[PDB]
Every structure is written in structure tokens, then in C-alpha cells.
């Protein structure tokens, strides 16, 4: 199917508590495969991603050096941000970035990503065109002018169309047994009375990979989106995810409700009901 590679980078200042801690976590779809931490000498590999262990020294040397370069840049960008927002040196601030590529079944680029936030808010993002920037405010417009002048978009696009695509393709090949396997949800419907005239129908989906899934309830073949309580998809701890969708139904009308499940692991969408 389709795949993604993403790095999630966080730099958090902590005045009076040493230099800002910098962390870069790498993922293939919903599988974490690497972690770089400024609080750690060497990177950590994921046991659930053993396919990364076959990389050898040249890969680890260059990645360690890129990370060190990134730690200095982000620590510097954090100092400049206080000036951009007229902020004191007393407070703790967070600079985040997330970047990477999306590829189709043929491993060709579907889309590239490179966005940054400061203190939880959008700061600057590389647009889908991989040429223009969206600056969120006047401080990010200064970054935007400095990056247009230095032709930074061209350098990032190069990574996104080049290195990012070629390395994801290699990671997917090396980890084909897991990265290429979709685990379908195991599903069931539970029932709990709320009162003498209403009951909750909860449609469960467990043990699925990737995390992406659609759980919907229909009443008489009509989507119940507005009235469905939907929990956030959550990790099980063994690479898989879990999610439920619940509806409050008039007691005695349970059979008019059908849960609809869509997931990459399923050849076609499932339909299931409460089976008393």
C-alpha cells in the first residue's frame, strides 16, 4: 500500500537547567525506528524495528553528525525566537518540527512535509508545492525572507524528493515482514443499559496496524456521526492500535444499528451488529 516516513523533532529550553534538550524520533508509518536524544551519547534502535540494525557504521556516523548539527541549529533558533517574540531569557520554550515524505505503492513521492511550530503554534511550513512557505505571523515572515534569500526550499525539496524517498524504499524492503503487513482489526459490539429506556452500543476494533481506521455507526443505514462518541485511537504497546465508537440507542432498537469498519487490513469494509 501507501507509506510515510516522518521525523518528529522537539527542542525545549529550560533556563537554569542546562542547554535545551533536543529529541529527533523517526517513524515509518506508525512504527518508531530510531530515536536521537541530546541527553544520550548514541541513538536508540527500536526492538520492534530490528530491520534498522543492518545499517552499519557509515549510516550511524552520518546520522549522529546530522543530529549534532541539528541540535546546534535548533538551540540557536531558540535564542533568536526570544528576540522575534520580544521574550525574556527566564521562560521555557519549545521549538518543534515534523518533516518527511509520503510514497505510493510504487515508492514514488506522493507528498513532502516540513513544518515548524514555536510554543505549540504553527510557525513556518513548506507548502505542498515544495517551493513556497506559509509564515504564520510577522516573526515567521523574517524566517521566510532569510530562507528565500538562502534558497532553503530547494535544499529541503532535494531531501524530500531524494534521500527521504530512497531511504523509505530501503527501510520498507529491509522491514518488509512488518512494515508491509497490515493487521486487520478484530471487532465486536458490546451493550450496556444506561437506563430502563436507553442503552450504549460500543463498537470495538483491536489489534490493528496501521493506526488509520474508520469506525462509524449507522441507524437504518444513515450515518450517526453527530451522535457517535469516538475515542482517540490508542496504542496497545505491541505495535497495534485500539479504538471504539459508541452510540446511545432507545432500548429495543439495537438491531436498527450497524457498525461500519474500514481499515487497510480488510479486503472490504465490515458491517457488524450487537449479537445478544
Amino acid at each position: 500500500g501507501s507509506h510515510s516516513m516522518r521525523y518528529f523533532d522537539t527542542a525545549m529550553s529550560r533556563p537554569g537547567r542546562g542547554e535545551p534538550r533536543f529529541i529527533s524520533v523517526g517513524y515509518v508509518d506508525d512504527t518508531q525506528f530510531v530515536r536521537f536524544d541530546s541527553d544520550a551519547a548514541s541513538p536508540r534502535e527500536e526492538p520492534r524495528a530490528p530491520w534498522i540494525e543492518q545499517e552499519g557504521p557509515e549510516y550511524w556516523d552520518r546520522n549522529t553528525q546530522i543530529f549534532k548539527t541539528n541540535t546546534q541549529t535548533d538551540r540557536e533558533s531558540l535564542r533568536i525566537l526570544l528576540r522575534y517574540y520580544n521574550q525574556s531569557e527566564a521562560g521555557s520554550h519549545t521549538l518543534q518540527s515534523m518533516y518527511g515524505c509520503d510514497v505510493g505503492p510504487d515508492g514514488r513521492l506522493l507528498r513532502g512535509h516540513n513544518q515548524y511550530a514555536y510554543d505549540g503554534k504553527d510557525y513556518i511550513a513548506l507548502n505542498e508545492d515544495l517551493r513556497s512557505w506559509t509564515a504564520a505571523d510577522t516573526a515567521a515572515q523574517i524566517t521566510q525572507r532569510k530562507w528565500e534569500a538562502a534558497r532553503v526550499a530547494e535544499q529541503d525539496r532535494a531531501y524530500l524528493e531524494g534521500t527521504c524517498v530512497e531511504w523509505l524504499r530501503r527501510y520498507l524492503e529491509n522491514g518488509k515482514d512488518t512494515l508491509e503487513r497490515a493487521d486487520p482489526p478484530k471487532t465486536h459490539v458490546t451493550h450496556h443499559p444506561i437506563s430502563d429506556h436507553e442503552a450504549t452500543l460500543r463498537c470495538w476494533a483491536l489489534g490493528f496496524y496501521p493506526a488509520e481506521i474508520t469506525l462509524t455507526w449507522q441507524r437504518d443505514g444513515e450515518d450517526q456521526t453527530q451522535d457517535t462518541e469516538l475515542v482517540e485511537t490508542r496504542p496497545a504497546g505491541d505495535r497495534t492500535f485500539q479504538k471504539w465508537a459508541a452510540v446511545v440507542v432507545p432500548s429495543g432498537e439495537e438491531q436498527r444499528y450497524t457498525c461500519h469498519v474500514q481499515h487497510e487490513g480488510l479486503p472490504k469494509p465490515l458491517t457488524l451488529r450487537w449479537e445478544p
Binding site: S24, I66, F67, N70, D74, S77, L95, C164
Partner: peptide, 9 residues
């Protein structure tokens, strides 16, 4: 594989 930051903010 990591991208190196081309420039700071």
C-alpha cells in the same frame, strides 16, 4: 535517514 537543518530560523 535524517535531514540536516539548511539554516536556522
Amino acid at each position: 535517514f535524517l535531514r540536516g537543518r539548511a539554516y536556522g530560523l
